[PDB]
């Protein structure tokens, strides 16, 4: 009779039950306890300012209308039946387009206990918005948020809470990090209030703190640019009479800087301001530009004022390495210390 | 108290007809609109559209849904919207749109004792607006959103903005990577067709493009290459290898700049303001190398005349290039 017992309990719960009304409607506030497990913190797109995350979403609340007495204390609902009861209308405030997985079947589970408690779990992939400040690129760090709450019920009707301490209510898997250009440092868990044109709502928030890796840009952009500037100052040590040698030297280092500059801008997103990399390239471009102007001055004074032409070349061998060396000290202390 | 609500709600939906509008056969039903803009992104020049996410609310009064005895606003499960009458609102310039559905459909229905119905939706839409890019990147754009009723006329339904100019919120919190919103505007009007009038609401934004990216990536590199081409005029004319190499390498550098800019900028196949400046700089470096051809050809027979051409080139070229910039920037700023 165990099979008949289980069937009877299923066919009795939804008798006289209206799913258009939340539990405790007109009597009390519905409390929903939530916790999140993150299985993979997916790719971050700097172009679109968005990121992907895969989570198990768990919610828990009490519904007195679904109490029962029987040999067992927990019931699992078929997804056809799980669509007959009231569930919270949780949505992500900064979500762009999310996916609920149903392969090979809907990845939902709803458990009912005898006292009336409901446990509701689902598997989701969320694409959310992470606005970024790129003034310090590529030495920038960002906090990408994740906010969710009720779409229709105000805080006088539905409130959200974390199942445990807020720190321990969001758990990331050991192999969760799936980032190629960022380093996930940690997360902070909070809870706030938002006011709209329709009322006041409870918002649950999580922030993921990311720091960009800079080793790639040092070997790809900064080192080639520094070597090209050093090469342009090598021209000062060639003899003045080698006019074709020094003209070819200077004008080809300008084309080399132009090639490097165009390559670097492809990685950067289309931002209005100037990043930390934009300023470094512009200064390097002005340095190689000034080295060719210097030879034009030296060549002009040769054969008429050889003393002045020699004096200009000797001072350039000191001023140019000094000014560029000074610029790097200021540059790498202004941005590495933020 | 919950049993009394259960009885009252089931009373309203008993005998309710979805196929008949409120005040059917009488005065038109008035619908008030609110828009809460959440984010604007992906302003595409090639596709000539933009993507918008917003909260869209509609307010109207239906006497068949009036209830008494409960001093509350009844927020019902969003699946009850299929059991009621809702306006046939649509967006006239919408290319692609959808309603978010995680974890459930982002929809709201709220009832009030007097019969007022609040109906909310969270919508992401791609709307088409024409962009005139002849002055790119020094251009301003005006993109709109048009709201109209598909089937009814002004004898059945009417549209108005709920709250006046405050009906649309959230524009002041928008940040665009390449643009800056200057103003937004709300227009309400009727369209007089042959079959009668039709209500329409319109929301427009004016965008002003940012210039900082183009100054350091497009204009300044081209200006410096032009100046370097004038170094040839201060070199002695018998240094043929130095001046030819300097002249022809600046032509290659200018070509490299123009080709790669075409690769990175959006593909807009007609003449813009940016194409005129790059082409103008290319002509200047073309003429600087052409100047040495004349000097090299006559510096042996007429060495004094060849020296006078180089001295005048030191003045005419910098003066004519600033004259080109003055006319260009006045006509575009």
């Amino acid at each position, epitope marked *: 009779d165990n099979t008949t017992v289980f069937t009877r309990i299923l066919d009795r719960l939804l008798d006289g039950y209206d799913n258009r009304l939340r539990p405790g409607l007109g009597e009390r506030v519905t409390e929903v306890k939530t916790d999140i497990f993150v299985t993979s913190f997916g790719p971050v797109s700097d172009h679109d300012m968005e990121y992907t995350i895969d989570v198990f979403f768990r919610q828990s609340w009490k519904d007195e209308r679904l109490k029962f007495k029987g040999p067992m204390t927990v019931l699992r609902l078929n997804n056809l039946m799980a669509s007959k009861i009231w569930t919270p209308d949780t949505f992500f405030h900064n979500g762009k387009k999310s996916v609920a997985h149903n392969m090979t079947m809907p990845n939902k589970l709803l458990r009912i206990t005898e006292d009336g408690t409901l446990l509701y779990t689902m598997r989701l992939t969320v694409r959310a918005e992470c606005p970024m400040h790129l003034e310090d690129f590529p030495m920038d760090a960002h906090a990408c948020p994740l906010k969710f709450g009720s779409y229709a019920y105000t805080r006088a009707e539905v409130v959200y809470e974390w199942t445990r301490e807020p720190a321990r209510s969001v758990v990331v898997a050991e192999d969760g990090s799936r980032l190629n250009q960022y380093d996930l440092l940690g997360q902070t868990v909070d809870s*706030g*209030i*938002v006011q709209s044109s329709t009322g006041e709502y409870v918002v649950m928030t999580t*922030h993921f*703190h990311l720091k960009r890796k800079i080793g790639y840009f040092v070997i790809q952009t900064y080192l080639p640019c520094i070597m090209t500037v050093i090469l342009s100052q090598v021209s000062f040590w060639l003899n003045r009479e080698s006019v074709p040698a020094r003209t070819v030297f200077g004008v080809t280092t300008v084309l080399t800087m132009t090639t490097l500059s165009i390559s670097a801008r492809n990685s950067l997103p289309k931002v209005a301001y100037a990043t930390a990399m934009d300023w470094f390239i512009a200064v390097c471009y002005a340095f190689v530009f000034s080295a060719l102007i210097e030879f034009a001055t030296v060549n002009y004074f040769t054969k008429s004022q050889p003393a002045r032409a020699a004096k200009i070349d000797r001072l350039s061998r000191i001023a140019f390495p000094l000014l560029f060396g000074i610029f790097n000290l200021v540059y790498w202390a202004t941005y590495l210390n933020r | 108290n919950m049993s009394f609500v259960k009885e009252t709600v089931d009373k309203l939906l008993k005998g309710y007809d979805i196929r008949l509008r409120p005040d059917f056969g009488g005065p038109p039903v008035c619908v008030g609109m609110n828009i809460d803009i959440a984010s604007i992104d992906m302003v595409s020049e090639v596709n000539m559209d933009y993507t918008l996410t917003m909260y869209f609310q509609q307010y109207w009064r239906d006497k068949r849904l009036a209830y008494s005895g409960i001093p509350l606003n009844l927020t019902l499960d969003n699946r009850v919207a299929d059991q009621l009458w809702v306006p046939d609102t649509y967006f006239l310039n919408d290319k692609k749109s959808f309603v978010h559905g995680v974890t459930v459909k982002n929809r709201m229905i709220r009832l009030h004792p007097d019969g007022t119905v609040l109906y909310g939706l969270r919508i992401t839409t791609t709307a088409a607006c024409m962009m005139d890019l002849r002055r790119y990147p020094l251009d301003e754009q005006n993109c709109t959103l048009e709201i109209e009723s598909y089937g009814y006329t002004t004898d059945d339904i009417e549209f108005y903005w709920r709250g006046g100019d405050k009906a649309v919120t959230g524009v002041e*919190r928008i*940040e665009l990577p390449q643009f800056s919103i200057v103003e937004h505007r709300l227009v309400s009007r009727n369209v007089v067709f042959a079959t009668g009038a039709y209500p329409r609401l319109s929301l427009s934004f004016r965008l002003k493009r940012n210039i900082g990216y183009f100054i350091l990536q497009t204009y300044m590199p081209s200006i410096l290459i032009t100046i370097l081409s004038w170094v040839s005029f201060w070199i002695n004319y018998d240094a043929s290898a130095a001046r030819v190499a300097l002249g022809i390498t600046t032509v290659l550098t200018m070509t490299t700049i123009n080709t790669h800019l075409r690769e990175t900028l959006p593909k807009i196949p007609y003449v813009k303001a940016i194409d005129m400046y790059l082409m103008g700089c290319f002509v200047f470096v073309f003429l600087a190398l052409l100047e040495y051809a004349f000097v090299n050809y006559i510096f042996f027979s007429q060495p004094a005349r060849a020296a006078a051409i180089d001295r005048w080139s030191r003045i005419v070229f910098p003066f004519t290039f600033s004259l080109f910039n003055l006319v260009y920037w006045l006509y575009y700023v």
Partner: nanobody, 123 residues
Framework: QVQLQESGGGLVQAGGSLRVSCAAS????????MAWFRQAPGKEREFLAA???????YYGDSVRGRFTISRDYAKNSVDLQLDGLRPEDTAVYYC?????????????????WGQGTQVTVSS
């Protein structure tokens, strides 16, 4: 340059409204987090409230339900409505702006700070 100038303050008779403002200049903080802090004499600097770009409001566990924060995004400012003031609320109220890296409730994550404004409560 960027300066956070603060107004309001003064003295109140152990109650009443007291709206402390904060005006920013030299940079638009629409995409930043604007917060308020409090430092009692010699004790510690304490977090009070914060509002992000999405208008989400965060409050400290001691001032929840008494102090209300708001932002006027057009004028690039932030306000804090102080109601039901008590003698323990006598301190220097600070205005801060930041990106909230590693936590919006920690003072060490805000780039810009105000010059302060003494608020005195007399009982």
């Amino acid at each position: 340059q960027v300066q956070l100038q603060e107004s309001g303050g003064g003295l109140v008779q152990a109650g009443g409204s007291l709206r402390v403002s904060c005006a920013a200049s030299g940079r638009t903080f629409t995409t930043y987090i604007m917060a308020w802090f409090r430092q009692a004499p010699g004790k510690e600097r304490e977090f009070l409230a914060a509002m992000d770009q999405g208008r989400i409001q965060y409050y400290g566990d001691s001032v929840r339900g008494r102090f209300t924060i708001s932002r006027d995004y057009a004028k690039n400012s932030v306000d804090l409505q102080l109601d039901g003031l008590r003698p323990e609320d006598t301190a220097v109220y600070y205005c801060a702006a930041g990106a909230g890296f590693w936590g919006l409730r920690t003072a060490s994550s805000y780039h810009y700070w105000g010059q302060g404004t003494q608020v005195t409560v007399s009982s």
